[PDB]
Amino acid sequence: DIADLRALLDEDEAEMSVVFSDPSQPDNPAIYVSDAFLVQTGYTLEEVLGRNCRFLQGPDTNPHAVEAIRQGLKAETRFTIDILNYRKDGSAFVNRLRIRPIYDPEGNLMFFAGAQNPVL
Amino acid sequence: DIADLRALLDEDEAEMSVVFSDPSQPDNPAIYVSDAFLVQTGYTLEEVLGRNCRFLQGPDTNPHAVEAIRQGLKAETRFTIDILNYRKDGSAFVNRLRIRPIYDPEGNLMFFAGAQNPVL
Ligand SMILES: Cc1cc2nc3c(=O)[nH]c(=O)nc-3n(C[C@H](O)[C@H](O)[C@H](O)COP(=O)(O)O)c2cc1C
Ligand SMILES: Cc1cc2nc3c(=O)[nH]c(=O)nc-3n(C[C@H](O)[C@H](O)[C@H](O)COP(=O)(O)O)c2cc1C
């Protein structure tokens, strides 16, 4: 029996690029990515699961945007940022990244949900 | 936004006493219990969340049954055992305990689900 993490998706994120990360594991790795995420970024599941999502950043990603995200995660609050991201073939795209914390019944942080929308 | 852990319940365990535990946390604590569990055992949510479910054991619980459960958890396999358990008022009941592991998409153990059925 495998957990149905998609059963925590918002209605918006169902047909979307979405990632869930486990902040209790070292380096806050992705434990679930939607097929839309894999299609957009050009990776296989094996290439992404268990890694921190920073692999989407590349040579022209703004490091302050990266730090903003890191602080936003520490804040455990909903936030959105436009950040330059890259696919496996090296092509770049502006990603409107939306992140929100998910807590367990006791109120302890449990997961982060991240949704990717390329800005056209 | 709070995780809907009940969205991993089997159809059988919906109207049932059920617990989910987080084995990545120290001492494998309960992170979710159903209202049926609280009613049966006589505890409040605050009294149970974040504790290992061994608080259901009492003076005449068979220690080999306890060890069986512990090994079954290490085995990460489905198992069932009849074990004497106790409510908060000290009354005892024979619990047919059914436990199953739940894994994440990478196949790493993520939760245990435990269902309680008093044997009549
Ligand atoms: C659920 C989740 C989804 C994320 N998605 C992206 C993303 O799509 N693009 C990106 O550049 N960073 C994303 N990140 C951010 C990185 O994983 C990381 O937190 C960021 O680089 C800042 O942390 P760092 O300083 O350790 O690198 C995501 C983080 C989380 C937790
Ligand atoms: C999800 C879950 C549900 C459990 N439910 C019960 C239970 O209803 N009654 C009981 O005696 N033990 C239950 N246990 C077992 C105890 O939590 C514990 O694993 C057992 O006492 C053996 O471990 P120990 O040697 O550390 O005490 C449950 C364990 C898990 C993980």
Automatic annotation (TrEMBL), chains A, B:
InterPro entries: PAS, PAS-assoc_C, PAS-like_dom_sf. The keyword Transferase does not apply. FMN binds at N52, C53, R54, Q57, R70, N85, N95, Q116. The keyword Transport does not apply. One of its GO terms (molecular function) is nucleotide binding. It comes from Dinoroseobacter shibae (strain DSM 16493 / NCIMB 14021 / DFL 12). Residues 77-119 form the PAC domain. It comes from the Bacteria. Riboflavin binds at N52, R54, Q57, N85, N95, Q116. It holds the Pfam family PAS_9. This is Putative blue-light photoreceptor. Keywords: Chromophore, Flavoprotein, FMN, Nucleotide-binding, Receptor. SUPFAM superfamilies: PYP-like sensor domain (PAS domain). The lineage of its organism: Bacteria, Pseudomonadati, Pseudomonadota, Alphaproteobacteria, Rhodobacterales. Residues 1-76 form the PAS domain.
